[PDB]
Design a protein around this ligand. Structure first.
Ligand SMILES: Cc1cc2nc3c(=O)[nH]c(=O)nc-3n(C[C@@H](O)[C@@H](O)[C@H](O)COP(=O)(O)O)c2cc1C
Length: 147
C-alpha cells in the first residue's frame, strides 16, 4: 500500500512525528509520500492513497488555531476527496493548555462530516515528540493492523 503524510510544523515537532511515523510505514512495505503542508495543494490531493496521514500542532491561548502552514489545507479539505478515505490524524501540543491538541480534534471532525473513515483515534503528543517516540511507533503500528 500507498500512504500520504501531510504535516504542519512551526517549531519542528510535528515534522519529527511525521518522520517517525513515515519509516514506521516504510519499513513495513509501505510506499510513502511525505509532505509539508506549507507546499501542498488541495486539488484532489488524497487521490490514489490507501491511507492519509494528516498532522498539525496547536496554537492560540483563548481560541484554537492550527499550525499556520496547515490552515489553507484545513480550509480546502472537502476539495481533496476524503470520501470513504482512510485517514488518521496526529500532532503535538502541551496539556498545560485547556484544549490540548485541539487541532487534532478539528481535523478529525471535518474529516467525518466529510466522509473519511478514521481508522484510529488521533495521536495527541504532550511534549517533545522525541521522548514519546515509542507512543509514536505503536500508533503508526496500530493504524497498519487497522486498514
Ligand atoms: C502560543 C502557544 C499556544 C499553544 N497552544 C496550545 C494549545 O492550545 N494546545 C496544545 O495542545 N498545544 C498548545 N501549545 C504548544 C504546542 O502547540 C507547540 O509547543 C507544539 O510543540 C507544536 O510543535 P510544532 O512546531 O510541530 O507545531 C501552545 C504553545 C504556544 C507557543
Amino acid at each position: 500500500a500507498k500512504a500520504l503524510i501531510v504535516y504542519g510544523s512551526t517549531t519542528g515537532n510535528t515534522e519529527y512525528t511525521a518522520e517517525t511515523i513515515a519509516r514506521e510505514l516504510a519499513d513495513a512495505g509501505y510506499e510513502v509520500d511525505s509532505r509539508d503542508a506549507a507546499s501542498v495543494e488541495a486539488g484532489g490531493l488524497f487521490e490514489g492513497f490507501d491511507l492519509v496521514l494528516l498532522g498539525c500542532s496547536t496554537w492560540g491561548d483563548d481560541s484554537i488555531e492550527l499550525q499556520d502552514d496547515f490552515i489553507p489545507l484545513f480550509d480546502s479539505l472537502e476539495e481533496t476527496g476524503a470520501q470513504g478515505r482512510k485517514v488518521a490524524c496526529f500532532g503535538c501540543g502541551d496539556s498545560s493548555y485547556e484544549y490540548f491538541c485541539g487541532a487534532v480534534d478539528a481535523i478529525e471532525e471535518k474529516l467525518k462530516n466529510l466522509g473519511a473513515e478514521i481508522v484510529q483515534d488521533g495521536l495527541r503528543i504532550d511534549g517533545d515528540p522525541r521522548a514519546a517516540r515509542d507512543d509514536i511507533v505503536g500508533w503508526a503500528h496500530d493504524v497498519r493492523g487497522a486498514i
